[PDB]
Amino acid sequence: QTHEDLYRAKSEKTMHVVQTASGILTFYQGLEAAGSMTREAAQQQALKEIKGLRYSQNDYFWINDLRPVMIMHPTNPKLEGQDISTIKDPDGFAVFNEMVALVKSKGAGMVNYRWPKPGASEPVKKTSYVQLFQPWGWILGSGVYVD
Numbered sequence: 001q002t003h004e005d006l007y008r009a010k011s012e013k014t015m016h017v018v019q020t021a022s023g024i025l026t027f028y029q030g031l032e033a034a035g036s037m038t039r040e041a042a043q044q045q046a047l048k049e050i051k052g053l054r055y056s057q058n059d060y061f062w063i064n065d066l067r068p069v070m071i072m073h074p075t076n077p078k079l080e081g082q083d084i085s086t087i088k089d090p091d092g093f094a095v096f097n098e099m100v101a102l103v104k105s106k107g108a109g110m111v112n113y114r115w116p117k118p119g120a121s122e123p124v125k126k127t128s129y130v131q132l133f134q135p136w137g138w139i140l141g142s143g144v145y146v147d
Helices: 003-034 039-051 095-106
Strands: 061-065 070-072 108-116 123-133 138-145
Touching: 003 039, 003 061, 003 108, 003 123, 003 138, 039 061, 039 070, 095 108, 095 123, 095 138
Parallel strands: none
Antiparallel strands: 061 070, 061 138, 108 123, 123 138
16 A cells, blocks of 8 residues: 555545536537537536536635636636736746646646635645646646645
8 A cells, every 4th residue: 555545545536526527518518519509608608507516615616728817716716817827826836837737748637736715815735636628728627725
């Protein structure tokens, strides 16, 4: 039983909630591909639904693109529609740029950074799984705060 095994286990949870939530993207992208909704309407519906999802103690999902611009953020909604390339956490970690570089290399993975908790302002350590949804150029993310 390795260190690698312990970390693989804890983060599988995060991976699996993101995979679950990404089925909404899948569903709506299918409606686009079939011609039943426009892309932008499929997008907006998918975001609306993912915005309300929660698990555990108020853990949530966000979506940013590869530019990176924030597409949907349920707890920091004033980031929506903004270029988030210049955001850095207190350790100097370039949160969204790193997420983009990660998914461009591997598709998905784990990243650690500091971020406020919902309705708070103090950046707290967080470990997130991010996953590229390729047809729309969207990164879907969720993570868990160290406490």
